[PDB]
Structure 1
């Protein structure tokens, strides 16, 4: 039973993922009561591109042994990869609807970075470091597609350029955290940045819902100081001063949006 599991692990060490998955399937055929076999089969199938078979293997492993958190780990990993691909295609659709080559190439680079981080987490599934890194990355691309849909609903060139700057800083911070996964400083920087983007999109949505020139100019002012401070903290992540500055800024945006 476990002999073919060892064989599949060995084949996976030699980068022969396909033969590894075949040996895992054969081991499961010998004894389908092996949760580790289904677990490894899903893990290796994730690397091939057959996300559906990997999800089925994860479901089988979870149903066979619920206490196995590692099975739940790659289950959430597959969910996150599907979520990231959905956000990527949504960003592509929004960029195509806008027609701007700038936002189109930015969405393309964002998709490329998401795929790179997905390949990284596929190579190292158990590492909570890159797990949470890609979690921040996927909320980043989600905030990005929310900003894109808000910009499309608005239609003004000013807020269009504002959303362009926001998604630019977003993908820049995402590239930073992808290059440096195990650095808590850029981790906190990314968390603060995505919180700032969430506050910014909420504020601009509320301003567009109101529809007054004064509140629109106020919204442009807060998002402009927000992109300023976000670029500042992205260039200087290890500064608790600028961290508290962004925290104060997002607190002020929240106070303003709940006041209006």
Structure 2
């Protein structure tokens, strides 16, 4: 049931019972720790649950199994943005556009992570890339 649990945890997520979906993502990981999906979902499920420190942990294991999802990097730069490390999250949004240069989200959201960090110079040059990638 390595895949059956992942879908069960989805259904539970579709009914707001996110805490109750957290188990079904574990029980899927327990049946296959390499199932890249069960990690990314569990991270987004802990991010919705706002188990914030632990949320970035599954988002780390996903970027290990498949180290090239602009989704998993972008959605980790978010979790790390709320978590506090606006430096490692700035590295995350950077590693995401290092994969996909057409990310109008990771560009704007890094313009914020940088305009709050210090370099208005380096936040500007991403603020003026997000203008290119959106009408």
Taking structure 1 as the reference length, what is the TM-score of the superposition? 0.35
Match of 1:138 in 2: 113
Match of 2:56 in 1: 55
Gaps of 5+ in 1: 87-127, 147-187, 193-260
Describe the superposition over 1:60-94 as per-residue Cα deviations: whole angstroms up to 9, x where unpaired: 112222233322222222222234789xxxxxxxx
Match of 2:100 in 1: none
Partner SS, residue 29 of structure 2: helix
Match of 1:174 in 2: none
Residue 22 (structure 1) aligned with residue 12 (structure 2): no
Shift of 1:38: 0.7
Partners in 2 of 1:55 and 1:84 — Cα distance?
11
1:21 and 1:56, CA in 2 relative to 1: closer, same or farther beyond 3 A? same
After TM superposition, list the pairs within 5 Å mapping 1:7-156 onto structure 2.
7-83=8-84, 131-143=106-118
Describe the superposition over 1:100-120 as per-residue Cα deviations: whole angstroms up to 9, x where unpaired: xxxxxxxxxxxxxxxxxxxxx
Match of 2:90 in 1: none
Gaps of 5+ in 2: 88-102, 129-135
1:8 and 1:129, CA in 2 relative to 1: closer, same or farther beyond 3 A? farther
Partner SS, residue 34 of structure 2: coil
- Give the number of the structure whose alpha-carbon radius of gyration is greater: 1
RMSD: 2.8
Partners in 2 of 1:14 and 1:133 — Cα distance?
31
1:69 and 1:141, CA in 2 relative to 1: closer, same or farther beyond 3 A? closer
Partner SS, residue 117 of structure 2: helix
Match of 2:6 in 1: 5
CA contact (8 A) 1:21 1:44 kept: yes
Match of 2:96 in 1: none
User: Which protein is richer in helix relative to its size?
Assistant: 1
Match of 1:97 in 2: none
Partners in 1 of 2:86 and 2:53 — Cα distance?
14
After TM superposition, list the pairs within 5 Å mapping 1:127-206 onto structure 2.
131-143=106-118, 191=127
Shift of 1:16: 1.4
Partners in 1 of 2:70 and 2:46 — Cα distance?
18
Partner SS, residue 30 of structure 1: coil
Partners in 2 of 1:134 and 1:73 — Cα distance?
9
Partners in 1 of 2:65 and 2:27 — Cα distance?
18
Describe the superposition over 1:116-165 as per-residue Cα deviations: whole angstroms up to 9, x where unpaired: xxxxxxxxxxxx5554443333333335xx9xxxxxxxxxxxxxxxxxxx
Question: How many residues align structurally?
Answer: 106
1:131 and 1:18, CA in 2 relative to 1: closer, same or farther beyond 3 A? farther
